[PDB]
Design a protein around this ligand. Structure first.
Ligand SMILES: OC[C@H]1O[C@H](O[C@H]2O[C@H](CO)[C@@H](O)[C@H](O)[C@H]2O)[C@H](O)[C@@H](O)[C@@H]1O
Ligand SMILES: OC[C@H]1O[C@H](O[C@H]2O[C@H](CO)[C@@H](O)[C@H](O)[C@H]2O)[C@H](O)[C@@H](O)[C@@H]1O
Length: 711
């Protein structure tokens, strides 16, 4: 069932007004339908025409924002009674009564139609359904601190001129905002020969001159509006006094352009102030996608393999005891890789010993201090001897503090001359400081690790990585530690001392922790109790009654081929046991007394007892009531798997010739029982139950089918 009427998450529209009902409710005498209101009406229609439930709830969140905006811009509008009513209906259609705390957290985030609320509700519902792991609270925490997601949108929503040939990220709509800032950049010594009245008058010149030198190529002014295709982070790491001093390789013009952008920005966020809404919404939803993958990556990470090699208290001494050349040989031929802290000292040491590394099969050098999403093609240009690498070059001046030599530049140079592959593993997004928040840090680290896993641990590779200490070893994560590049790649992290000692960098215990959290306001746990919701639908027989014929593949595929014949022997033994056939019952509810007798007989036959299993579900009763129905079974253990032995299954609808004792892997047993009973929202616990504990065993209460509000 792709959208069951029995699911609590069906997002039903029964209690949400249609456009025509709204018209009559929001009609005011002498006031024709304005443009805000006509887009509110079109959004409502889309909601009612929406078949895809995820999209529907997305559109509903969008409508809530439009109503928020209308309410803010028209505080005395007489249409506000109807709109406030509609907004409440949308909240109640999306957020069930038991979701109050979730609702409060999600709807406090600004810009309800930005994609954050859509993502958070999707995640919350999957978490409650037991289809995703525990993640919602932490994603809410990430969202609340993020300078893009948690910012009320103040950017550009207008159209983009068609003459622009680059994808636009930021727009300054009215150029005259530059003339409103504190600093007179037109009065600067470097612009006396320009003789310009104001900042906005400098602007066309600043672009034109930088544009020729290679920089700022994705900036265009059309009709008093400035359009930008360079990312905030790209600009920050390629434009500074280190790369843009007076009379330098890239002059002053980019730095002045960026400096006054930041002044116009004020104490708003960059994206909050200048971003296109399209680009804003894309950023919000991609940040959340990526943080989710990062968190998933930390889940159940096993430190045992790494600690087994590098985690002994004295590994530092065993590393130090070796000669420098013995370490290089070990790192290259045994570990297949090593990582250095991103200091110039470490780079210098590496370069001083480069021949030794190459002779032992070094194939690649990787650094996190450059963003592949910006400069990877330009890096390839450098290596191919070509000249189209201006942004790369400017970023190297920044990394090298404006030095002509500089460790990072030397590193790139050696890779070219020695035919070693060079890779950037940094990602530009969310990479600009301050890193005063563990979630921003974790997000940034996670993207670098994902790239490194993808590109670096490949069987025919011997690599060296240069990265920040925070990226190399473990850091605080979401409910658990966030492991470093080095743990993920199965390598050691190293530093070079101030007096040239190449030493191991231990993963300290204080870093291998969860991020410190306060519980969110009134927060309730979302994940289901214990056991499993099979599905939020009505289960049905797909292909008629099950038979021993149909069950055979389920039994044979449950175990390896060399164990197949022993399982069948055990199943034959059970089905042809005299005391087992005595226990057979087709009375309604008989599993209560039968199941324990089965467990006792299995024991006496010399089989290993399993935990058993129980299934419970809702059943439509007379007069719109739903009762709970349940069934339990004993099991045996074989090859680390549990097999139901169900001698009371014939109380349920069955094939005419069917066996009296049902034997299937527990998961196949549950499905069969659910389908034969046409079970609504069935729930399995992997224990057999008896007496009161069977008689009142029911699914999670939020799954009991209910009517939608109302109106
Ligand atoms: O745009 C209006 C306001 O919307 C949000 O506040 C609403 O939603 C909260 C959570 O459900 C409620 O606590 C609150 O009573 C509602 O008004 C948002 O949190 C505010 O910042 C907006 O001003
Ligand atoms: O630039 C200041 C204004 O920012 C917001 O308005 C922008 O964002 C809205 C939602 O995307 C658009 O509808 C609107 O056209 C944009 O200008 C904010 O809503 C306003 O209060 C500010 O004046």
């Amino acid at each position: 069932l792709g959208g069951s009427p029995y699911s609590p998450f069906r997002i039903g529209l029964e209690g949400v007004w249609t456009p025509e009902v709204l018209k009559a409710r929001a009609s005011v005498i002498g006031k024709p339908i304005g443009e805000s209101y006509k887009r509110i009406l079109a959004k409502l229609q889309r909601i009612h025409n929406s078949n895809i439930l995820d999209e529907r709830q997305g559109l509903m969140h969008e409508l809530m924002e439009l109503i928020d905006l209308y309410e803010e811009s028209q505080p005395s509008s007489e249409r506000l009674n109807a709109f406030r009513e509609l907004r409440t209906q949308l909240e109640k259609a999306l957020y069930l009564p038991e979701m109050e705390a979730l609702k409060k957290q999600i709807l406090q985030i600004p810009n309800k139609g930005s994609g954050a609320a859509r993502f958070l509700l999707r995640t919350a519902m999957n978490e409650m359904a037991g289809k995703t792991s525990e993640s919602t609270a932490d994603l809410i925490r990430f969202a609340l601190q993020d300078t893009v997601i948690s910012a009320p949108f103040r950017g550009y929503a207008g159209a983009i001129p068609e003459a622009i040939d680059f994808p636009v990220k930021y727009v300054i709509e009215d150029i005259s905002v530059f003339d409103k800032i504190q600093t007179n950049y037109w009065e600067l010594p470097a612009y006396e020969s320009w003789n310009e009245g104001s900042n906005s008058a400098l602007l066309p010149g600043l672009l034109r001159e930088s544009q020729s030198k290679g920089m700022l190529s994705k900036c265009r002014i059309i009709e008093n509006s400035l359009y930008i295709g360079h990312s905030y982070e790209e600009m920050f790491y390629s434009i500074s006094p280190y790369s843009n001093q007076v009379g330098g390789p890239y002059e002053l013009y980019p730095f002045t352009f960026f400096s006054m952008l930041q002044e116009v920005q004020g104490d708003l966020g960059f994206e909050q102030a200048f971003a296109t809404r399209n680009f804003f919404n894309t950023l919000v939803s991609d940040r959340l996608s990526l943080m989710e993958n990062t968190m998933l990556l930390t889940e159940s990470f096993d430190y045992t393999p790494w600690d087994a090699i590098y985690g002994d208290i004295n590994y530092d001494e065993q590393f130090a005891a070796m000669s420098i050349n013995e370490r290089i040989e070990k790192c290259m031929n045994t570990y297949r890789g090593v990582a250095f802290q991103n200091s110039s000292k470490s780079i210098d040491f590496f370069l001083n010993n480069l021949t030794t590394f190459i002779d032992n099969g070094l194939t690649e050098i990787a650094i996190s201090d450059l963003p592949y999403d910006i400069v990877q093609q330009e890096i390839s240009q450098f290596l191919q001897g070509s000249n189209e690498w201006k942004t790369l070059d400017a970023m190297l001046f920044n990394l090298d503090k404006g030095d002509i030599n500089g460790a990072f530049r030397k590193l790139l140079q050696s890779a070219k001359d020695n035919n070693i592959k060079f890779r950037a593993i940094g990602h530009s997004d969310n990479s600009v400081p301050p890193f005063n928040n563990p979630y921003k840090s974790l997000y940034y680290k996670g993207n670098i690790i994902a790239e490194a896993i993808e590109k670096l641990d490949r069987e025919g590779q011997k690599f060296v990585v240069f990265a920040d200490s925070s990226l190399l070893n473990s850091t605080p994560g979401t409910g658990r530690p966030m492991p470093g590049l080095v743990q993920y790649l199965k390598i050691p992290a190293t530093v070079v001392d101030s007096d040239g000692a190449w030493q191991f960098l231990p993963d300290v215990a204080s870093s291998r922790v969860p991020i410190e959290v306060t519980e969110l306001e009134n927060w309730q746990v979302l994940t289901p109790p214990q056991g499993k919701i099979l599905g939020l639908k009505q289960f049905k027989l797909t292909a008629g009654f099950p038979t021993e014929q149909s069950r055979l593949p389920l039994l044979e595929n449950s175990v390896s081929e060399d164990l197949r014949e022993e399982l069948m022997q055990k199943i034959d033994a059970i089905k042809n046991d005299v005391k087992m056939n005595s226990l057979v019952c087709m009375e309604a509810g008989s599993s209560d007394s039968v199941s324990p007798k089965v467990a006792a007989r299995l024991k006496d036959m010399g089989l290993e007892a399993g935990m058993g299993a129980s299934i419970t579900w809702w059943r439509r009763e007379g007069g719109m009531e739903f009762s709970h129905q349940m069934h339990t079974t004993a099991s045996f253990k074989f090859a680390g798997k549990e097999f139901a032995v169900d001698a009371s299954h014939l109380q349920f609808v069955h094939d005419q010739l069917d066996t009296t004792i049902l034997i299937l892997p527990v998961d196949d047993w549950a499905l069969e029982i659910a389908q034969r009973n046409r079970a609504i929202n069935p729930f399995v616990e992997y224990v057999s139950k008896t007496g009161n504990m069977l008689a009142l065993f029911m699914p999670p209460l939020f799954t009991k089918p209910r009517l939608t509000r109302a109106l």
